[PDB]
């Protein structure tokens, strides 16, 4: 592409051609036109999946949830126009977004009725049916996770950044474990690096050693970050990554901090958190050899709103590791309260 | 960090914040540590046994060429019999085993030309006889903390205090976005693409270095052998899976004597390459046009992959190391006399 960059201290510019990686996190994904492979094709795929034994869909990220929301109406209309007793019901997303073992098939022949595009304006809202194909919601009771399909779409072309472009998707033929690399952008320039996608924005810096600086996550996806989109992949232990490999954290020396290990039991149930290295308001952390061992993550404030003041760690490094969610400060697994017993404090109940 | 960009294929425009990597492959006025510390460093180096300087890149050569007059002015007005003469740069730029020493104190006097002296401190040039490479310094500077930026036009280097073999990371930028990637610095521009697997697409070089590309600035550094990298690691090629192409190995005997190269996977004009099971083995690279101007036309390779590897020198169109003629003997063609 071609682009220009700007300096505001001295008002002027720099232009050229190259690769540009934008901060596309915290932007509304629902202002695009989504084109999954085809209405007839996708209807046949859903029909065959229901006949095989797949009950529903577990969404990889929020973008697929929005896609299914945009598509469900026409999908049900096309299914009804063919005399198939099946309805698609779309729910809500809660974190972390766990994985399913099934995959969505690729039909040989599509259904022989309906229109040949998405966005056919005017169709008769369809009728409810006793058989339901549930996209992920609060429905892990009618069908378990082991019968749900996961990570079954491939992005073919997209225009994210322009709020009325079209997104083209396709049902893949293969079993895969990695995140879709069409929306990943990684860049390093001097002493700063970024690993990013549509939901992650992870920053790094060069102090005495390369280390993590701050992360901003609006979702907790459980795919695998592809190695072709990672800087400094070799010679790194899986036990030292701040963001676990099971949560689509890149396997790199840029995902490390001195004195901390992998945060398996952090507050991943949050809808959105932000990882940063400093103390929380009205708290102090001291390095003490008599402090307790690492365990699940704890919240700085009590369930009654009382702030705990004195914390400790055995061999961590200052500033401490904290997660800033909507509730408030949480602390890393290495930091425990110095005086008050842990039974008076709320803890994370999830593990990656 | 704030800027706008356009995609002319789709004809769409957007703006925002992010990290931008520009193609820079002149506008800089360089500032070493000082005009009074560099002189003391050169004085101590001469009195220590270091007879000259071997450049790392064209950046350093331009710096020395720009600062030589002033450096001689101070070094002569301060009472030292020593003159710095800087020559041109020949490729490839080989390493040296010595390093410049950091002075304890500056020269007391300093802030009109000088006269030629009998003592010569030769910077990179055609003077390999009064100063052999065994007694030359190499990779002895670092760009300072905030010495470089998108909007800088004036780069501030400092004399290094340690021994390193790696290139300066302050001027390196790599990025990947979807199905396109780039590893670049002030002298390289190396591109990659995703067809069925990641592979090298094209590379534009205006200098051949011998430092080492840092692993912190490289994508996909694991599970790769040095025998597969097209641009050899000895020539500051990245230890990356983006530096590979199926059917080819490391090009140790390419035309690295050149002055500005351009790698692309396309046949030279008026030539044909056929994959033949009865073709000669690999060795030094050959040029399509003979020294008399005749163009060779028929070429073969044992198990290479079409399209073939070629180097677009300023004076010709060379082939990869695996591609050989069928009929014409290679004793009469032009070959590369350098190796990595």
């Amino acid at each position, epitope marked *: 592409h071609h682009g220009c960059s700007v300096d505001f201290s001295k008002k002027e510019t720099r232009c050229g051609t190259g690769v540009f990686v934008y901060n596309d996190v915290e932007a509304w994904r629902d202002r695009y036109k989504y084109h999954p492979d085809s209405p007839r094709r996708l209807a046949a795929a859903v029909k065959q999946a229901w006949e095989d034994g797949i009950c529903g869909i577990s969404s990889v990220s929020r973008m697929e949830n929005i896609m299914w929301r945009s598509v469900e109406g026409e999908l049900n209309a096309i299914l009804e126009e063919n005399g198939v007793q099946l309805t698609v019901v779309v729910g809500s997303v809660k974190n972390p977004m766990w994985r399913g073992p099934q995959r969505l098939p690729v039909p040989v022949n599509e259904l022989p009725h309906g229109w040949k595009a998405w966005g056919k304006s005017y169709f008769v809202r369809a009728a409810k049916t006793n058989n339901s194909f549930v996209v992920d919601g609060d429905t892990l009771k009618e069908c378990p996770l082991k019968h749900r399909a996961w990570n079954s779409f491939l992005v073919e072309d997209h225009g994210f950044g322009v709020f009325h472009t079209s997104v083209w998707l396709k049902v893949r033929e293969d079993y895969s474990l990695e995140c879709d690399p069409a929306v990943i952008g990684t860049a390093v320039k001097g002493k700063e690096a970024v690993h990013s996608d549509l939901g992650y924005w992870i920053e790094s810096e060069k102090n005495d050693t*390369w280390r993590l600086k701050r992360a901003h996550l609006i979702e907790m996806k459980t795919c695998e970050w592809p190695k072709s989109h990672t800087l400094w992949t070799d*010679g790194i232990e899986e036990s030292d990554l701040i963001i676990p490999k099971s949560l689509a954290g890149p396997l790199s020396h840029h995902n490390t901090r*001195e004195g901390y290990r992998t945060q398996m039991k952090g507050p991943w149930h949050s809808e959105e958190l932000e990882i940063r290295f400093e103390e929380c308001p009205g708290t102090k952390v001291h390095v003490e050899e008599t402090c307790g061992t690492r365990g699940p993550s704890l919240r700085s404030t009590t369930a009654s709103g009382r702030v705990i003041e004195e914390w400790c760690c055995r061999e961590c490094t200052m500033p401490p590791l904290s997660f800033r969610a909507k509730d408030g400060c949480w602390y890393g697994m290495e930091i425990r309260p110095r005086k008050e017993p842990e039974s008076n404090l709320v803890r994370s109940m999830v593990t990656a | 960090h704030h800027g706008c960009s356009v995609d002319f294929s789709k004809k769409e425009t957007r703006c925002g914040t992010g990290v931008f990597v520009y193609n820079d492959v002149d506008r800089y006025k360089y500032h070493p540590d000082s005009p009074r510390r560099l002189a003391a460093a050169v004085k101590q180096a001469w009195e220590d*046994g270091i007879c000259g300087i071997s450049s790392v890149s064209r950046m350093e050569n331009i710096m020395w060429r720009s600062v030589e007059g002033e450096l001689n002015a101070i070094l002569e007005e301060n009472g030292v019999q020593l003159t710095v003469v800087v020559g041109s740069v020949k490729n490839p730029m080989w390493r040296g*085993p*010595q390093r410049l020493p950091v002075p304890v104190n500056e020269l007391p006097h300093g802030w009109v030309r000088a006269a030629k002296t009998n003592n010569s401190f030769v910077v990179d040039g055609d003077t390999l006889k009064e100063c052999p490479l*065994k007694h030359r310094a190499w990779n002895s500077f670092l760009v300072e903390d905030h010495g470089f930026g998108v909007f800088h036009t004036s780069v501030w280097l400092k004399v290094r*205090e340690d021994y390193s073999l790696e290139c300066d*990371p302050a001027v390196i930028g790599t990025a990947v976005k979807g199905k396109e990637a780039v590893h670049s610095d002030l002298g390289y521009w190396i591109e990659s693409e995703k067809n069925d697997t990641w592979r090298l697409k094209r590379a534009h070089l205006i200098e051949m270095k011998t430092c080492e590309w*840092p692993k912190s600035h490289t994508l996909w550094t694991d599970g790769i052998e040095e025998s597969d990298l097209i641009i050899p690691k000895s020539l500051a090629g990245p230890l990356s899976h983006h530096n590979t192409r199926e059917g080819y190995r490391t090009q140790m005997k390419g035309p690295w004597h050149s002055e500005e190269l351009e790698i692309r996977f396309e046949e030279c004009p008026g030539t044909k390459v056929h994959v033949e099971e009865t073709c000669g083995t690999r060795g030094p690279s050959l040029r399509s046009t003979t020294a008399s101007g005749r163009v060779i036309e028929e070429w073969c390779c044992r198990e290479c992959t079409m399209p073939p590897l070629s180097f677009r020198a300023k004076d010709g169109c060379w082939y990869g190391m695996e591609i050989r003629p069928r009929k014409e003997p290679e004793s009469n063609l032009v070959r590369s006399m350098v190796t990595a």
Partner: antibody, heavy 116, light 106 residues
């Protein structure tokens, strides 16, 4: 400058061990640290190196079993030795790359015996 | 896998005699050779680097030369403290390889 490596003893074959190297007079984050071993009655052999920037390289003999690391807080160089075999016994040295590409400063050695 | 071969395997010379030791590589290794001296029970000591440069603090009676594939380490005036084993090693590429060693006795 001073280099003193500590943790070398006797160990059963198939076991694990960990050596340390403490640096005095300089900081380890500025020099190229390496490990060299000398078998009893034999010559020297280079094992692994760590760059000042953090990159590590190994010999084919020890490629997948040994790992090199450092700590800047304690100013210490480590070497983790895993799945030891009979021919790993030697005196292990701790050297720095100064100029040319030769080792200017060494340690005193620490004997590692692998036998049952 | 640059194999470095040294010769002779042993020399016995008295005080005051010049001593010459040769080293050979299996490839090109331009000008990137170092020489070490190792008395029994101690760590080795660097003497020559870059095939001709002398390390700070080492007596000047040591001198080395060579290029390409053939190298030579020479001593002028044997001293009672010059009896040890001497090693050559290439510094061209990884892995770094040493030589068999050569003892200077009597």
């Amino acid at each position: 400058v001073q280099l003193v490596e500590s943790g070398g003893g006797l160990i059963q074959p198939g076991g694990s061990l960990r050596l340390s190297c403490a640096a005095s007079g300089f900081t380890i984050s500025s020099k190229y640290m390496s490990w060299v071993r000398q078998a009893p009655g034999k010559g020297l052999e280079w094992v692994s190196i760590i760059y000042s920037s953090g990159s590590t390289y190994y010999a084919d003999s020890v490629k997948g079993r040994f790992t090199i690391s450092r700590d800047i807080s304690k100013n210490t160089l480590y070497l983790q030795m895993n799945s030891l075999r009979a021919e790993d016994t030697a005196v292990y040295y701790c050297a720095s790359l100064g100029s040319g590409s030769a080792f200017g400063y060494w340690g005193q050695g620490t004997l590692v015996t692998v036998s049952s | 896998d640059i194999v470095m071969t040294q010769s002779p395997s042993s020399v016995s010379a008295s005080v005051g005699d010049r001593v010459t030791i040769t080293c050979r590589a299996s490839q090109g290794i331009s000008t990137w050779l170092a020489w070490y001296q190792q008395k029994p029970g101690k760590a080795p000591r660097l003497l020559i680097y870059a095939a001709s440069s002398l390390q700070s603090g080492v007596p000047s009676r040591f001198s080395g030369s060579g290029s390409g594939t053939d190298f030579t380490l020479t001593i002028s005036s044997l001293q009672p403290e010059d009896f040890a084993t001497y090693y050559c090693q290439q510094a061209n590429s990884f892995p770094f390889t040493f030589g068999p060693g050569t003892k200077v006795e009597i």
